[PDB]
Amino acid sequence: APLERTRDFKGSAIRLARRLLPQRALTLAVILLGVGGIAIGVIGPRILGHATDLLFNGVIGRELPAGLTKEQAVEAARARGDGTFADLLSGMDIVPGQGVDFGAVGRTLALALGLYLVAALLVWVQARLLNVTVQRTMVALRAEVQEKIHRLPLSYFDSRQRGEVLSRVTNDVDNIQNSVSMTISQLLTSVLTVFAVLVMMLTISPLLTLFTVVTVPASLWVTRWITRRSQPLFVAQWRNTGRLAAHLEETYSGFTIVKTFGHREAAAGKFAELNSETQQSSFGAQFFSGLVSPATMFIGNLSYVAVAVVGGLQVATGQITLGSIQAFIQYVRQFNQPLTQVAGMYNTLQSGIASAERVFDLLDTEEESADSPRRADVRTGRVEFEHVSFSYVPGTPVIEDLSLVAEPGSTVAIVGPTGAGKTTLVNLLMRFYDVDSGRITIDGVDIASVSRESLRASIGMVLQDTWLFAGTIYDNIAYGRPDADEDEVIEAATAAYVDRFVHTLPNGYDTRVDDDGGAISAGEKQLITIARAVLARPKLLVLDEATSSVDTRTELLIAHAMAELRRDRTSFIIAHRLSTIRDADLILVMDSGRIIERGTHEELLARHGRYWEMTR
Amino acid sequence: SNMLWALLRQYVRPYRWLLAVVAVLQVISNMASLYLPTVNAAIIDDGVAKGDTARIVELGAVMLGVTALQVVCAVGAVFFGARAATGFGHDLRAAVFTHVTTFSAEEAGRFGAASLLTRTTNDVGHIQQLVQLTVTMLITAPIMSIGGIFMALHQDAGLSWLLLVSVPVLGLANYWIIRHLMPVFTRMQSLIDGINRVLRDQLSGIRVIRAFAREPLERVRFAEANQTLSDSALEAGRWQALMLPVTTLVINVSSVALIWFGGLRIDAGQMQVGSLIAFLAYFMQILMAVLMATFMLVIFPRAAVCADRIGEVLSTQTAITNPADPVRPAAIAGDIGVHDATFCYPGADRPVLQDVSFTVPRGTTTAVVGSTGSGKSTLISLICRLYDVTSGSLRIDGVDVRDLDIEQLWSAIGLVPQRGYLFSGTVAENLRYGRADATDDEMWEALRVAAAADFVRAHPQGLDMPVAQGGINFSGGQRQRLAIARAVIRRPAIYLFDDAFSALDVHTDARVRDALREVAADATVVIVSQRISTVIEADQVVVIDDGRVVGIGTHDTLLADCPIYAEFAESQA
């Protein structure tokens, strides 16, 4: 994004600061070391200026006739028509008949060298401690985000858009880290530098500092003007890049159709247009960022010219020594430095606080239900629904009065038009969503007045989307019960028809499924999932019979494996195969939600209507 | 490494004069920024050492001109640098796309529809950012360094060896620090990608994690990844901590030594004090410029790997191309005539097809049924020259398909691929890809023969329903029946249904098949399918197993004498 509506800047920034709080010893040390390394960095050029004065008071002042004090020398400069040279002399510490006093210059530079060494050491140590504290807070922030992710209800992850939480948790924390490191280091250093340099300038002469500080409002106004002018040129670049990426991805994914239907020159023409349009906008944006870079340097150079000329005119009349103006020129450079960075500092700080607002509004949602501490013992699996009524959206209901009687060996099936929300019963059973009224009784107890670990560990699910994480095949199958030896995991991977494809692969049981996977065919992934489910020895199955890229060998393998998984378990099968729907007991059709039918396929075949024409 | 310059020399070639102007303006800007302190030194020598003050005012007038010149040159450099850095990047991503749109899906299957996109979108961005930063921030290092040595030689050539000893020491120290810092930086980036992958895998499977109750096992894994990334970031910052103090220490020790030796030189009437006032500025500016260059130099290996990717794309030569003399017939009949095709993949030893030979008559369908993995989609994609045969012939009623003007062929081909794709817009536009001038009745008949007019008639918008990016707002049957409608619009001579029927309801499957056989009577159809139910209606169903046509003939004769009957029929039914 070019910018972002922050929607709160005081609360968010104070909340982030109190996040940084617990490392208060480290932050105090960082601040004190910064103050020290800045003081010793602004009291250096003053001592170098004293050394330059020691050189000047001797290189001009050894040529005067010896014997005279610095009143008769000045008067002799006057009488010979050198009034301004007389001013210059009367501003010095002349002793006629002298001229380098190199011991004093030696001692002055020896003092400055030690101060510079100490300042370097202090800056290094401050950098180390700042790094330590930034990492110590980022670790805890990420840990908090994770502990939250594992408590949010599924309604949260289902309501959000596609790929939004992943951005809330990945890129926003990086933005926060950048903002924190930048603000501490650069803002603290630059503000303290400006303050110390201003104090030193006031000590030297209160007029050239007037110049150096009257040049500031112009710098800030120019920065504001250029940023205000450049924002509408960043929104255009972001927009045009979005359009270009959209056209590219929709002409790359559908390339066979783009090509085989004729529209191969039209795609090139539209791309040429989008390419020109994104170049013409990237140019403007980059040019204006450029512009804001050296305009502040121009204004700083105007200030520096004014300082140089007026300082020369003041030293040349004996109102300021030469070391003072040398130190002042150094101070002018050090002061005009951060006025060029202010813009980028503000940009990154604003981006970071917007990201922090997003993350802290993620971290303020509500946790699911604080489940009861009672273990569930599903001895048989006789599920009984009791007047359940679900909504999915308070108001319009999806389920109505429902009284499933799922017996131990039963195979309750759900057949209907795909997209009718056929997973509502699945979500109700695993307790991903609470029921608004009713009672789901799993062999006496009800899934609401029991824990969730025990219940969900005594059910077991086999869904449409096969989930495999980065790791071996052995790790994925041991995910079902990660305290069983290779004997049990291999017995599981043999119960499902995995061992065959393991033999086919070069390094079976250590092949990374997603990393360099390549050939698992996404029909063997379903077998890995069935093995993972058969390892956890469930007692009450929830599972769907959908397919993907139907083969023959793998299709028969999946059918037989998922029919031997349902040995005696009570199953809530999302039936998409004729063999299973033929052998069922409480077939349900879902009319966009709304189970409205019933029957054992016999009274449902005599009164078929929707039933037979749907299962045809 | 060797490829980054290979394209960074070729695609910046038109903007040579722009980079020359950028360089000759940066030189002037930096020389003026260095010439301000020497006018200040001339103020202190010719001004406050004698009684002159008019000389101070004149030299102030000179400094005004110098700073105006500097700002003009700096703004010009910014302008031309931006112009060139966007021209290179408007040309790179266009030579990439004009290449990628010449592949043949056998050269595009190697990269993937997302790696291609990122290669032509963000890699060019990463190289263009490097060009921008190397025309606005890296050029100030050599210019300022050499100009500072020359300004010091001119000012007083007895203290320029302070520059000649202070610049190499700083450059060498920073080279050592950078050499030690780069590997841990790349490793930290890899660990960042690792933790992002952990988060993505935890968020995409938040139901499978909550089932199996494996939350305590997913917290430990993330804690491990987090602590590892933190340790790597600390070890990376352990050198950025050093990088700046070394610079400031070199500057300050050089300034102290400057005062000492310059005073020893002033004493013996060989210098003025303005030289002291100027050399401190020379030191500060030069060494800060070198520091900033070393800061920025950490961005190069990323550009190297991105340019490796882009060169990989721009290197793969294309095989399928229009012929030399495009023999063209008046009208493409469509009597496909495959004779002895193999199509061995680029790298493997297993010719997918082998000795394939059969003829589709002028108006009859032909189902190519076989094991999923025996290479039949290869056969379809060979008919419409997406892949190209390695040996054999692919006649289209007389002419080898490697001699036809490919646009003619593709204009006489109605293809329905395996997965359905719909482009962003209105359903009217997607259906407009077929005929390009479609009256409403035409779209309606093509949508009812596709069994898809129901959900596009029962919608408030009607025949303008908003379609998502890849038709993802629809689902399954909707998308495939919209693709079938798009193909039926054209009324081509050859309907190639790649699979096109598997992801469909069997009842509506029979409905659309019969609708076609009613409207597609005078045309050739070729259906590659695994399900046998859609195959009984064929006329010349051919079997394909392990790349051989083992079994040709009507479904009845085939079921009479072939293993296909037993295996496939008894496995399906």
Residue numbers in the entry:
A (entry chain B): 9 to 624
B (entry chain A): -1 to 571
From the paper:
Here, we determine mycobacterial MsRv1273c/72c to be an isoniazid efflux pump and determine several structures by cryo-electron microscopy showing specific asymmetrical features including an N-terminal extending loop and a periplasmic helical hairpin only found in MsRv1272c. Thus, MsRv1273c should have a degenerate site impaired for ATPase activity while MsRv1272c has a functional consensus site with the classic enzymatic motifs. Confirmation that this is correct was achieved by mutating both E553Q and D497N, creating the double mutant, which has little activity. Thus, MsRv1273c/72c is a drug efflux pump for isoniazid, but not ethambutol.
Using single-particle 3D reconstruction, the cryo-EM structure of MsRv1273c/72c was determined at 3.1 Å resolution in the IFapo state. The central cavity is located between the two TMDs and it opens towards the cytoplasm. The two NBDs are separate at both NBSs. However, interactions are maintained between the two NBDs at their C-terminal helices. In the IFapo structure, the NBDs are separated both at consensus and degenerate sites by 8.4 Å and 10.7 Å, respectively. For example, the region containing a part of the D-loop, a part of the Walker B motif and the connecting residues (554AT555), which we assigned as the D-WalkerB loop (552DEATSSVD559), adopts a classical S-shaped conformation when the NBD binds nucleotide.
